[PDB]
Amino acid sequence: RGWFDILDDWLKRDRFVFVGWSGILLFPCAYLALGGWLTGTTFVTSWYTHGLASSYLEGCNFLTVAVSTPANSMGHSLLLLWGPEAQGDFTRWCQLGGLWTFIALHGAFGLIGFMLRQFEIARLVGVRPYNAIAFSAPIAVFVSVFLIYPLGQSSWFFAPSFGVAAIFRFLLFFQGFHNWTLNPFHMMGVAGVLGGALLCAIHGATVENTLFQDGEGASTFRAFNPTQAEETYSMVTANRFWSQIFGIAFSNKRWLHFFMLFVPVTGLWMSAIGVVGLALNLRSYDFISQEIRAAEDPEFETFYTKNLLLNEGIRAWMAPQDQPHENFVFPEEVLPRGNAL
Amino acid sequence: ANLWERFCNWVTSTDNRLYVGWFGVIMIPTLLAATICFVIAFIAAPPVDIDGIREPVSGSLLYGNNIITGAVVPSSNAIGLHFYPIWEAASLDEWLYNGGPYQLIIFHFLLGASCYMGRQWELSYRLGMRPWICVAYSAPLASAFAVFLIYPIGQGSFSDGMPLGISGTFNFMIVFQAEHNILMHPFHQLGVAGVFGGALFCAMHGSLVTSSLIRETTETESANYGYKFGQEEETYNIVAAHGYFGRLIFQYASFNNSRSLHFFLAAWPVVGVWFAALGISTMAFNLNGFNFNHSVIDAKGNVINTWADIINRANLGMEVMHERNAHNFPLDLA
Amino acid sequence: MEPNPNRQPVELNRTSLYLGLLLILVLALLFSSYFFN
Amino acid sequence: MEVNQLGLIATALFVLVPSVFLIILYVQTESQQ
C-alpha cells in the first residue's frame, strides 16, 4: 500500500464515470479530439490549405463544416504547435491545418485509451475481453483511413477532413480515382456492415417476437426481471420459425452471439486492408481482359466500362478545385463530356 | 375431409420442412420463376439496349462479363414504364434485345418477396409467436421496391431501375448521386446511421454477450458447447454485462432489460433502413438532397467554395459522362 | 517411447463444415474475377 | 477473353485446398466414437 496502490485505489473507485489508469490516456485525448473538432468547425477556416470555407463563423452549416486537412505542401508533417511550421503561433497553426493533425493524433491516442478502458473494466468486473477485441475493427478503420492512407499518399491533404460533406467528398474521390467500389476488400466490408445490420435487425426482432408471456401487460418490457435465471424468449420456437421460413436457423445462442461479433468486425478489418492498398494506389481499378476487349471492340460495353467513364468525369471535373496545389488548368475543350450535357 | 380440406391442411401445415402457407403458394412459383430466369440471363443473355439508343450493354458471362461486371440489364428506355412480357414481343430475340428478362425477374421477385413478408407473419401466427418479424423484413423489402419499382415509376422508365448485377449496382449509385445528391439527403444519412449503427450494435451485443458467458466448458473445448439447445437457464450473465457496459460509458446508458435491449436492436437498423428506402423513393420524384452550391458568398460577391461545392464538382463529372450518347438537349430532366 | 500426453483430439462439426465451405466458396466466387483479371 | 493464364489454377486451389482441409477434419470427427 504505497503511493502507487493508493493511486490505483482512487482511479478504480466505483463512481459515475469510471476513470481507471486508462482514463489518464483516454479522457484528455478524447476531449481534445472532440473539442478540437467542435472548435475548428465553429471558428476555423480552410482558406489557406484548401481554398474552402469550413466553419460556422464563415457561413457553413453542420453538413458543410469540417476541420480540413493541411495543405499538400505540408507533406506528412506532424504540424506540432511548437513545430517549425507554426513556430508557436496558434493563429498560424489553425490556418495551416494544425488542428487536423491535432484531432487525428489525439483521436488516435484517445481510441487507444478507449480499448485500454474496455480491457481495464472487463478485468475488474471479471468478464472476458471480447468488447475490446471487437473494438479493434473501428481502430483498424481509423488507423488505415486517417493515418496509413495519407502516409502512403503525398501528404495529409488526401486524408479525410473531419466533416460531413468533407467525408462525402472522400467517398467520391475514392470512386473517381481508386474505383473503390470495385475492390473486393471494400465489398467484404460492405457485406460485414450490411450483414451486421441484418443480424442486428433479425436478432432483435426474433427475440421480441418469441418472448415468453411472463406478465399480464400488453407492453411486454415489464415482464423481464434483470435477475431472472430463465431465458426471456423461446430459442426452440425461434429455431423452428427460421428453419421453416429460411431453411437454416441458429440452435446455439453462444454461437449466434459470437457470429454477431464476427460479421461486422471481420468486415471492417477487410475494408481496412483494401484502404492500405489504396495508400499505395494499389487499386482494384481495372479488369485487364475487359480493357483489351473494349479497346479492340468498340461495340463491347459493360456496366464496368460505363463506370470508368463516370470515373474519368469525376477526375477531370473535380481535380482543379479538389487539388488546388497542383494548379490544374483544364481548358473547357479538354473536359470529357457526353453529348448535350 | 374432402380434398380441399386435405389440401388446406397440407398448405398451412406446421410439419412441413419449409413452411408453405397461402403466401407461399404465391411466393414459391414467383421466386422460382425469378431465380431461374435470373441464372439463365446472368449466364447467357445477349446484350440489351438499356438506354433505348441502339447501344446494347453486355450483361452475361458468356458475352464477356465476369461475376463483378455481369448483370441482368434493365429494360430499354424506349419501353419506359410499359409492361413488356414475352408475349408482347414479336420473338424471343426481340424480347432479349429490349431487356425483357429484367422486367420478368423484378416483377416476379417483388411479388415473391412481398409474399415472403406475408409468409413470415403466417408462420408466426401458426407457431403462436408474436407477429412482427415481418415488420423488420419490411425494411429491406421497401428498399428493394425503392430501387426496382418506385424509382422507375418516378423517373418514367424501368431503364432507370437498379440493374441485377454488382457493377450495375455501382452504376446505379454513381448516377443517382449525380442527379440527386443522395449523400446530402438526410434520409440517406439516417440510412447510413442505421447500417453503421446496426453493425456497431451487432458487434456490441455480440461482444457483450460473449464477454459474459457463464463458464461451462474446459479450455480444450469450444465455449459454444456450454449452451444446450432448448435449455431453460440463460447462457450469459446479463447483470455482469450491464455491470461492464454501465461502467464503460455510465450506468444509465446501459440496458438492464433484455427485452428493451433486443427491441432497440430491432428498432435502430429497421427505422434507419426504412428512412433509406424513403430516401430513394422520394428522390424518385426528384426531391433531392441539400444543395449548398454557391451558398457562401464574400462581401463583394465572390463565391467562397465549401466542401459542398467540391461534391458538386464530382457530381458534374458523373453527370456529364453518364449515358454519354443519350442526351440531345441541355437538361437531364428524368 | 511413451506417448505424448499433450495430444488432443480435433473436431469440426457439420455446421462448421457447412459454414467453412460457404466461406471458401463465396470467397472464391468473389476473388475469381480478380484472379482471372 | 484474354484472362490471366494462372487464374484457373489459382481459383481451383483456392477452393480445393481449404475445402478438403475442412472435409478431412469433419470426416475424422464423425468417425470418432
Binding site: G247 | - | - | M1, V3, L8
Partner: peptide
Amino acid sequence: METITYVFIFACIIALFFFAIFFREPPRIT
C-alpha cells in the same frame, strides 16, 4: 474456362445450400 469456373462455384454453393438445409445436424432439445 472463366464462365465454367464461375458457374461451377455457383453450382457448388447451391449444392451446399441443399445439404445445409436438408442434411443439417438436427437441432435436438435436451
